[PDB]
Structures are given as structure tokens and as C-alpha cells.
């Protein structure tokens, strides 16, 4: 089997991407944030505290003839941006782009933090990291990909995120028309439950490539590119007027600037992030100070190849017995 679904930016800045997901019988379609940095599929639901729902579409298990309460199971998750959610668990039928899993754990939110409430466009998350990170207790549950894997034509999914445009998540096949050149594959460590890999270095603009190992995660659920402070300082030093602002919470730059590209290494291959991808717009409405898309990972504890990086590539998440990651230009 295979699946193919379009993923769409939630706003003009590509702050996140939503993908429609069918849950239950008859289908209830929710727009979920596919997140390769976490491993829970959770949804706004009929059980979510009413004051914490503001425009989202909810899953109502009682209206699904295939929903079954997973007795005794609870979940609770906190994300890197400080947001959180928790609740109980059902199993139900879940389909993405024509690919159907029966008996998928659908985590129903009883509580969500303010950032989720305030984002009306995201109805939940669909985790695509390794199932060892799944938070369901006392019986850990498998991700959608893990459940689908054996049925897929090939045990892979691909992320093809757009810049200010829709893109695609595919399951079970590699669309050879979706990228240019070749796919370069690189080793993955699953030791922390992530799609963790080591970039071979970077360049800023038309500058020389610096060969240096950068361990980090491929994370579709993170907006920006978070890299070591040395790398980030080297980038922003090429933008007149750019500075790190403690009050804003990162590097900002004059909105009048033309940003240089940023290149990262995948083995001997190179992925180029155009300068425009690094512009996240005014820090507040009307400001001439703009927020940067490359930020320091210092104090996160991990480097994160988020959407800013991933959207410059066609990315293969290879879930073979020894997982690997593949990157191609497009």
C-alpha cells in the first residue's frame, strides 16, 4: 500500500504545516501537524476542556462506530517550545492520503496549553519520530508510520515541504519526479528516539564550505533551523545590522536586508536554503525589525533541522531495519 497527502502552510510565514487526516467511521477529517520530532497522534476532541477550544475541529469518538476506549490509558506531552497537552486514548481507524491503519491509538486531549488553543488552524499532531518516544501509559503505543510499515510497498515516508506553498507527505514510495539529481542517504541514530543524523558542514552565501560535523534532528514539527552558536553567528555576521536580541528571543535583522543563502552538507552533497526562506517577517506588526529563521540551539540541548532546512529538500525517512535519512535538492 501507499498514501499521498498534501501539506499546507498554516500562514504566510510557513510557521507550521497541516495535513488532512481521516479519523473514525464515518470519517472525521482533522488537520494535523505532522511532526517527525514526536511520537504521539493527539487531537482536539469532544473531551477537550471547552475554554481551551477556539476554532479547531474536534474528534468526537462517540460518533465513530470504530472507536474503542483504550481502557486505563493516559498520555501527557510537553514540546520544545514549552507547549503541552494531555488526555486519554481511543483506538480507531486512521487514514492519510488513502493509506489506512486500523487500531491506531488516537490520543484525545482533555487539556491543551494556550499556544494550541490560540492556533485555530491546528487540530492536533501526528507524530512520526520513533515509537519509543510515545507518551501513552501504562502501555506505550505505536505511531501511524510504525503501524503502517509492514503494509507499505517500501518502509519509508517522504517530506516535501513547500516554501510559501503546499507540499506533500508520501508513505510507502519515493516519487522520483519530485526532486532533482540524486538522493544522498546518511546514517541515523535512533538512540534518543529521533531522526538524528550528522551534517557534514555548512556555507554562508557564496562563502567557502566549512567541513564540520553537526549532529541534529530532522524535525518537521519545528519551524526554524537551530544550529550551534558559532555557525549562527557566522551566518548573521553577513547581514548588516543583524543582532541577537535577548528581549525578542533570538537574532533579528533589518527588514530592508537581502539575506544570504545557507548551505548544509549531507555527506558529499549540499542542500542550499535560499535567503528568503530565512525571513520570518516583522517581530511585531509594523516593525522594521524582522525575525531570523536560523537561530542558536544553545540551551535547547540539540540541533534541529526544522522546516527552514527541510523545505529546501526532498527528504526520505527510511524506516528499514536500520533506518537512514535521504536528502535531495528539488
CA torsion, points 177, 315, 233, 289, in degrees to nearest 10? 70
Neighbours of 246 (CB within 10 A): 6
- 108, 90 Cβ separation under 8 angstroms: yes
- Span between the terminal Cα atoms of the chain, in Å: 25
Distance, CA of 1 to CA of 160 (rounded, Å): 19
User: How is residue 83 written as a grid cell?
Assistant: 507547549
Strands in 196-204's sheet, in edge-to-edge order, are 269-273, 262-266, 196-204, 210-218, 303-305, 225-227, 294-296
The helix/strand/coil state of 222 is coil
The helix/strand/coil state of 133 is helix
In terms of domains, do 60 and 150 share one? yes
- 36, 219 Cβ separation under 8 angstroms: yes
In terms of domains, do 61 and 9 share one? yes
DSSP 8-state assignment for residue 312? T
The sign one gets for the Cα dihedral 196, 155, 270, 262 is negative
- Last residue of one domain, picked from the residues 174, 196, 220: 174
Residue 236 gets the label, from left (phi > 0), alpha (psi -120 to 50) or beta, of alpha
Distance, CA of 220 to CA of 37 (rounded, Å): 7
Report the candidate in 250, 264, 240, 248 with the shortest Cα–Cα distance to residue 297: 250
Strands in 279-282's sheet, in edge-to-edge order, are 243-245, 250-254, 289-292, 279-282
Neighbours of 326 (CB within 10 A): 21
User: How is residue 105 written as a grid cell?
Assistant: 491509538
- Phi, psi (rounded to 5 degrees) for 59: -90, 130
Distance, CA of 146 to CA of 79 (rounded, Å): 21
In terms of domains, do 17 and 96 share one? yes
- 217, 309 Cβ separation under 8 angstroms: no
DSSP 8-state assignment for residue 139? S
Cα distances from 247 to residues 31, 225, 250, 251, 310, in angstroms, run: 33, 20, 8, 10, 28
Measured at the CA of 165, the angle between CA 305 and CA 131, to 5 degrees, comes to 40
Give the residue numbers spanning the domain of 273: 175-330
- 275, 225 Cβ separation under 8 angstroms: no
Q: How big is the chain by its Cα radius of gyration, in Å?
A: 20
- Last residue of one domain, picked from the residues 151, 174, 197: 174
CA torsion, points 267, 313, 315, 75, in degrees to nearest 10? 120
Report the CATH number that the domain containing residue 298 is assigned in CATH.
Answer: 2.40.70.10
Distance, CA of 72 to CA of 86 (rounded, Å): 14
Half-sphere exposure of 219 (CA within 13 A, CB side): 23
In terms of domains, do 113 and 182 share one? no
Among 14, 33, 35, 160, which one carries the catalytic annotation?
35
Which position has the grid cell 504521539? Answer: 40
In terms of domains, do 94 and 230 share one? no
Q: Which helix H or strand E contains 124, and what residues bound it?
A: strand 124-127
Report the candidate in 21, 315, 18 with the shortest Cα–Cα distance to residue 158: 315
User: How is residue 160 written as a grid cell?
Assistant: 516535501
- Last residue of one domain, picked from the residues 143, 174, 205: 174
Distance, CA of 42 to CA of 59 (rounded, Å): 10
In terms of domains, do 152 and 212 share one? no
- Phi, psi (rounded to 5 degrees) for 158: -125, 145
Distance, CA of 116 to CA of 44 (rounded, Å): 9
Report the candidate in 55, 59, 47 with the shortest Cα–Cα distance to residue 23: 59
Distance, CA of 272 to CA of 209 (rounded, Å): 12
Question: DSSP H helical segments within the chain, as ranges?
Answer: 114-117, 144-148, 229-236, 307-310
Q: DSSP states of 74-121 as a string?
A: EEEEE-TTS-EEEEEEEEEEEEETTEEEEEEEEEEEEEE-HHHHT-TT
User: How is residue 187 written as a grid cell?
Assistant: 546514517
In terms of domains, do 142 and 205 share one? no
In terms of domains, do 10 and 156 share one? yes
Q: Look up 199 and say whether it is catalytic.
A: yes
Cα distances from 277 to residues 31, 295, 309, in angstroms, run: 24, 13, 9
Using DSSP bridges, classify how beta strands 124-127 and 41-43 pair: parallel, antiparallel or unpaired. antiparallel
User: How is residue 195 written as a grid cell?
Assistant: 531522526
Neighbours of 51 (CB within 10 A): 7
Give the bridge partners for 78, in sequence order: 84
Give the bridge partners for 92, in sequence order: 104
Question: DSSP H helical segments within 204-306, as ranges?
Answer: 229-236
Distance, CA of 181 to CA of 60 (rounded, Å): 45
In terms of domains, do 155 and 219 share one? no
Cα 20 to chain centroid distance, Å, stands at 15
In terms of domains, do 148 and 18 share one? yes
Half-sphere exposure of 112 (CA within 13 A, CB side): 29
User: How is residue 227 written as a grid cell?
Assistant: 544550529
- Phi, psi (rounded to 5 degrees) for 54: -140, 75
- 282, 290 Cβ separation under 8 angstroms: yes
Structurally, the chain folds into a number of domains equal to 2
Report the candidate in 253, 237, 275, 99 with the shortest Cα–Cα distance to residue 170: 99
Which position has the grid cell 536500520? Answer: 322
Distance, CA of 328 to CA of 313 (rounded, Å): 5
User: How is residue 290 written as a grid cell?
Assistant: 524582522
In terms of domains, do 113 and 240 share one? no
- 119, 26 Cβ separation under 8 angstroms: no
Which position has the grid cell 473531551? Answer: 47
Among 38, 45, 86, 199, which one carries the catalytic annotation?
199
Q: Look up 62 and say whether it is catalytic.
A: no
In terms of domains, do 206 and 309 share one? yes
Amino acid at each position: 500500500s501507499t498514501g499521498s497527502a498534501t501539506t499546507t502552510p498554516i500562514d504566510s510565514l510557513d510557521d507550521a504545516y497541516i495535513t488532512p487526516v481521516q479519523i473514525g467511521t464515518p470519517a472525521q477529517t482533522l488537520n494535523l501537524d505532522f511532526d517527525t520530532g514526536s511520537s504521539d497522534l493527539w487531537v482536539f476532541s469532544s473531551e477537550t476542556t471547552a475554554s481551551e477550544v477556539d476554532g479547531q475541529t474536534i474528534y468526537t469518538p462517540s460518533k465513530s462506530t470504530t472507536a474503542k476506549l483504550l481502557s486505563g490509558a493516559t498520555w501527557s506531552i510537553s514540546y520544545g517550545d514549552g507547549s503541552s497537552s494531555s488526555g486519554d486514548v481511543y483506538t480507531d481507524t486512521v487514514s492519510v492520503g488513502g493509506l489506512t491503519v486500523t487500531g491506531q491509538a488516537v490520543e484525545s486531549a482533555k487539556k491543551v496549553s494556550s499556544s494550541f488553543t490560540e492556533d485555530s488552524t491546528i487540530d492536533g499532531l501526528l507524530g512520526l519520530a520513533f515509537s519509543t518516544l510515545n507518551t501513552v501509559s501504562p502501555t506505550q503505543q505505536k505511531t501511524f508510520f510504525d503501524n503502517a510499515k509492514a503494509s507499505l510497498d517500501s518502509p519509508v515516508f517522504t517530506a516535501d515541504l513547500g516554501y510559501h506553498a503546499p507540499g506533500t507527505y508520501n508513505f510507502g514510495f519515493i516519487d522520483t519526479t519530485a526532486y532533482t539529481g540524486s538522493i544522498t542517504y546518511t546514517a541515523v541514530s535512533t538512540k534518543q528516539g529521533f531522526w538524528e543524523w550528522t551534517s557534514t558542514g555548512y556555507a554562508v552565501g557564496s562563502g567557502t564550505f566549512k567541513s564540520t560535523s553537526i549532529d541534529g534532528i530532522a524535525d518537521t514539527g519545528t519551524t526554524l533551523l537551530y544550529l550551534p552558536a558559532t555557525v549562527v553567528s557566522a551566518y548573521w555576521a553577513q547581514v548588516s545590522g543583524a543582532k541577537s536580541s535577548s528581549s525578542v528571543g533570538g537574532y533579528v535583522f533589518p527588514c530592508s536586508a537581502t539575506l544570504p543563502s545557507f548551505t548544509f552538507g549531507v555527506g558529499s552533497a549540499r542542500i542550499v536554503i535560499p535567503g528568503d526562506y530565512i525571513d520570518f517577517g516583522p517581530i511585531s506588526t509594523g516593525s522594521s525589525s524582522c525575525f531570523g529563521g536560523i537561530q542558536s540551539s544553545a540551551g535547547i540541548g540539540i540541533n534541529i533541522f526544522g522546516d527552514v532546512a527541510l523545505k529546501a529538500a526532498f527528504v526520505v525517512f527510511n524506516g528499514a531495519t536500520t533506518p537512514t535519512l535521504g536528502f535531495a535538492s528539488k
